[PDB]
């Protein structure tokens, strides 16, 4: 450090009385980056407090100065202001008291409902569990949508990516997954409950207000924490919001409970971290991103797992969201998150405007856990359904100009049309697992080959009412047995034929 004051006090041997070991002065401040002289006993990733009451984090420990990312507007910070180290890394409150509350990236409530009575706080930089304490994923995390609970199943403790373009329905999938858990949280079985965390990163305040209104109207807010880092917030807040939400979910995971975290979206966190790294003069790489932008998301998403029965048995399933520009999944951040997560759910604009909502591209969407993340009845019907969909895709790849096709090819094409109309689902209406099993079973057993596809949703709107009113004993038999026995298959076929006679 060679400034005029330092050179003046070193030529004269002044030995100034300001002990800069536990404090410091600002050399320069700009765009949320503060270079601070002093703080000799500071440590990496440590919180500091400025003279105006603002907080900051030390990210660069250079031999000359300290690089601080400012958690707020940099207008309050001036050159030469006093910075005091807090002595601790960033921590956020955790507990059951955060359920129903809308908090920011630091845990401060912003809904105006008073304080939070949390008795425990967890740091955000916690090491992920190793290979030993975690166990294989087998508990189903039911999204509530037929296109995803059958073809791309998600298990408790799995990092499942929701990747797509703008205005395709990634937030719709996440919110519907949050809403679906009201069926289990209102029940008495404790192991089936799932507490939700939604982390909004970079969105406008009207969008977050609409999300909170949607969760309040559907009574899904009672088990949901919303961590908000809006567009007008600081880049360190948007960078740190996924880690604070992960710590909030890790409280439930480490206490034997099951938590589901949505990061909407990790692209905004990558942009915020890119801005902080570029303004800290770190060397950029591909698409101006730093070399640690893979390590950032891998460190975040490696903490989402299901613990073993010796560690309480709790789980943490993560649903990161990635926005893709014009369908280019070969970009840096989509490639990194795809290589990190245990599968992806791909959404396409062409499928969305074609009527297929949710617009899940079945061919490009993988779930690495697979049938282990399904119940037995759903596995039984989805195993045939994915094969029939694959056969339909293979025969429709060469059926655009084909008119005088084979009878088997026409049957496969008709079955694929019925299944494609079966996978469509409206917004804000999650479905129970038994309804999905029954409807997919009717689709893949040939019961809808004689039914016009445009009435299939109406058939879905009516046949589910028929078995819930006049043939509930079949549903009770399915629930108690847990599988579609051939006797129950024959009874369901008789019910379907009677209903189609009535239809």
């Amino acid at each position: 450090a060679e400034i005029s004051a330092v050179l003046e006090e070193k030529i004269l041997g002044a030995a100034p009385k300001e002990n800069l070991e536990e404090t410091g002065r600002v050399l320069s401040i700009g765009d949320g980056i503060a270079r601070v002289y002093g703080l000799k006993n500071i440590q990496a990733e440590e919180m500091v407090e400025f003279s105006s009451g603002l907080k900051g984090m030390a990210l660069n420990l250079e031999p000359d100065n300290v690089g601080i990312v400012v958690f707020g507007n940099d207008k309050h910070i001036k050159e030469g202001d006093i910075v005091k180290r807090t002595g601790a890394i960033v921590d956020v409150p955790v507990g059951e008291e955060l359920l129903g509350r809308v908090v920011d990236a630091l845990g401060n409530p912003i809904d105006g409902k008073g304080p939070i009575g949390s008795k425990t706080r967890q740091r955000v930089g916690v090491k992920a569990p190793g290979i030993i304490p975690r166990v294989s994923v087998r508990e189903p995390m039911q999204t509530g949508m037929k296109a995803v609970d059958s073809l791309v199943p998600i298990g408790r403790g799995q990092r499942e990516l929701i990747i797509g373009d703008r205005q395709t329905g990634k937030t719709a999938i996440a919110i519907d997954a949050i809403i679906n858990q009201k069926r289990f949280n209102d029940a008495q079985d404790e192991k089936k409950k799932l507490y939700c965390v939604y982390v909004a990163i970079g969105q406008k305040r009207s969008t977050v207000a609409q999300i909170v209104k949607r969760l309040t109207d559907t009574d899904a807010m009672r088990y949901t924490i919303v961590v908000s880092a809006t567009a007008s917030d600081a880049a360190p807040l948007q960078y740190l919001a996924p880690y604070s939400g992960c710590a909030m979910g890790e409280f439930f995971r480490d206490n034997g409970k099951h938590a589901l975290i949505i990061y909407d979206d990790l692209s905004k966190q990558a942009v915020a971290y890119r801005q902080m790294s570029l303004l800290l003069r770190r060397p950029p790489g591909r698409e101006a991103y730093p070399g640690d932008v893979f390590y950032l998301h891998s460190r975040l998403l490696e903490r989402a797992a299901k613990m073993s029965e010796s560690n309480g048995g709790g789980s943490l399933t993560a649903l990161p969201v990635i926005e893709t520009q014009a369908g280019d999944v070969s970009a840096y951040i989509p490639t990194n998150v795809i290589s990190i997560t245990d599968g992806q759910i791909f959404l396409e604009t062409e499928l969305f405007y074609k009527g297929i909502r949710p617009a899940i591209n079945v061919g490009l969407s993988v779930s690495r856990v697979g049938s282990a993340a399904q119940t037995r009845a759903m596995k039984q019907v989805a195993g045939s359904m994915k094969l029939e969909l694959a056969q339909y895709r293979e025969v429709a790849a060469f059926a655009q100009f084909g008119s005088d096709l084979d009878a088997s090819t026409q049957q496969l094409l008709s079955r694929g049309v019925r299944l494609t109309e079966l996978l469509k689902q409206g917004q804000y209406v999650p479905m129970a697992i038994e309804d999905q099993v029954a409807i997919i079973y009717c689709g893949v057993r040939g019961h809808l080959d004689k039914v016009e596809p445009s009435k299939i949703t109406k058939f879905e709107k009516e046949f589910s009412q028929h078995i819930k009113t006049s043939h509930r004993d079949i549903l009770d038999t399915i629930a108690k047995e847990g599988q579609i026995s051939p006797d129950t298959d024959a009874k369901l076929k008789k019910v379907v034929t009677d209903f189609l006679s009535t239809f």
Binding site: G125, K127, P129, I131, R134, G291, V366
Partner: protein, 455 residues
């Protein structure tokens, strides 16, 4: 031999020494870290300070912290004691099974064998898998690409390779999870415990595991393959064994090398870890070779560039009930030449491949028009091809408790004789289903006799 930390920028630590400067690739231990932090010297910056890459996390480091130079590269424990254990980059056990008590330590940076230490004969490593030993043979010292996705027995095939090499040849195996997921690593470790290849308290382990997590720094994941190669090199040099080295994968190793080069800032991100350029990968590739003492056979696990052999696993072959689900037509090998593996082996393999291709054409013709075509010659071709496809299947030793079928080890002469008898039609009167899940060809004859006596 003692230095002080000057700069900490990410996983890059600049450390200044006073008396003796450590050489490149030496390991320096940070004296204030309770999980000890090892820094590998990447370059000399002059002014008695060196730039190092970190093998662990960097949060909490302070400038001026004392670093002790070891005077050697990263020396990992090697020996029979590392069999059945899991090690990180720097040799610490991470499987919570206690300390690795050994007497041998080896640096992870060694020289390749010389031009006079290499054998001029391109010998093949017979692995006892009939489809592998016939259609896509494994060469000693070669580069092997193992394909396969979800639902196929790629893990079971890897463990069968480990068990068959440890049984037929007596050489161990090393698995190196370069940047692998924790869930996949835990599944692989538990499957290795269940199938008996990794054995606790019995000292009958056949594979040494080296793991690097995705939350590790880029420097840590770029040296996991070097640690696994060092364990394999101990098993080759000091025991004279043919050793398998499974790497998962070369792509993540190249990715970690590219991230290290991006952190160092010298080489731009457009160029990362060429197969040549001994600093990057040429030393690692040339240390996987066959010498007069032993051989290292590299198998890269690829999930769906210089491979000597390739075994492609398909879902459709598993849908036909053939285990292993190796595609006989898409599994190629550079070793398939009359001048290396012999004329009769190439002739039998070419005849089997031609019969399978004609069988696929005949199946297409049958699907188009019907099963009657070109008299009974096509029917005889179809019957011989289906007997070949049944005979390609084989029970696994490692999967004898999940399938109930006792696995068998088939020597290469038995596979050659059996497929020669099928091609010549000497066993053409036997039923097709008698050719299913049988190791040798005498077992096919016994199976057909038992079928004829029962029916």
């Amino acid at each position: 031999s003692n230095g002080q930390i000057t700069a900490v920028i990410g996983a890059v630590v600049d450390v200044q020494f006073e008396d003796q400067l450590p050489p490149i690739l030496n390991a320096l231990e940070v004296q204030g870290r309770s999980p000890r932090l090892i820094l590998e010297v990447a370059q000399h910056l002059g002014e008695n300070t060196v730039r190092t890459i970190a093998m662990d996390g960097t949060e909490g480091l302070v400038r001026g912290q004392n670093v002790l130079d070891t005077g050697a590269p990263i020396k990992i424990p090697v020996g029979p004691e590392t069999l059945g254990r899991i090690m990180n980059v720097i040799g610490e056990p991470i499987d919570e099974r206690g300390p690795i008590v050994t007497d041998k330590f080896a640096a992870i940076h060694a020289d390749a064998p010389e031009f006079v230490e290499m054998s001029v004969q391109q010998e093949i490593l017979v692995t006892g898998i009939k489809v592998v030993d016939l259609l896509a043979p494994y060469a000693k010292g070669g580069k092997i690409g193992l394909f396969g996705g979800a639902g196929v027995g790629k893990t079971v095939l890897i463990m069968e390779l480990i068990n068959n090499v440890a049984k037929a040849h007596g050489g161990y195996s090393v698995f190196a999870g370069v940047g692998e997921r924790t869930r996949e690593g835990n599944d692989l470790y538990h499957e290795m415990i269940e199938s008996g290849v990794i054995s606790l308290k019995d000292k009958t382990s056949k594979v040494a595991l080296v793991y690097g997590q995705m939350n590790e720094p880029p420097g840590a994941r770029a040296r996991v393959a070097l640690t696994g190669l060092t364990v394999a090199e101990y098993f080759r040099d000091q025991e004279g064994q043919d050793v398998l080295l499974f790497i998962d994968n070369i792509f993540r190793f190249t990715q970690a090398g590219s991230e290290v080069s991006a952190l160092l800032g010298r080489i731009p991100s457009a160029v990362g870890y060429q197969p040549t350029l001994a600093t990057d990968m040429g030393t690692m590739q040339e240390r996987i070779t066959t010498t007069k003492k032993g051989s290292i056979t590299s198998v890269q696990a690829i999930y769906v560039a210089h491979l000597d052999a390739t075994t492609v696993l398909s879902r459709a072959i598993a849908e036909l009930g053939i285990y292993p689900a190796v595609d006989p037509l898409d599994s190629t090998s550079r070793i398939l030449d009359p001048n290396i593996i012999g004329e009769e082996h190439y002739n039998i393999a070419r005849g089997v491949q031609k019969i399978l291709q004609d069988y696929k054409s005949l199946q297409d013709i049958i699907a188009i028009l019907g099963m009657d075509e070109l008299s009974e010659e096509d029917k005889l071709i179809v019957s011989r091809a289906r007997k070949i496809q049944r005979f390609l299947s084989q029970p696994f030793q490692v999967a004898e408790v999940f399938t109930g079928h006792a696995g068998k080890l088939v020597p290469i002469k038995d596979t050659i004789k059996g497929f020669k008898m099928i091609l010549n039609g000497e066993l053409d009167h036997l039923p097709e289903v008698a050719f299913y899940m049988v190791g040798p060809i005498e077992e096919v004859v016994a199976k057909a006799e038992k079928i004829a006596e029962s029916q």
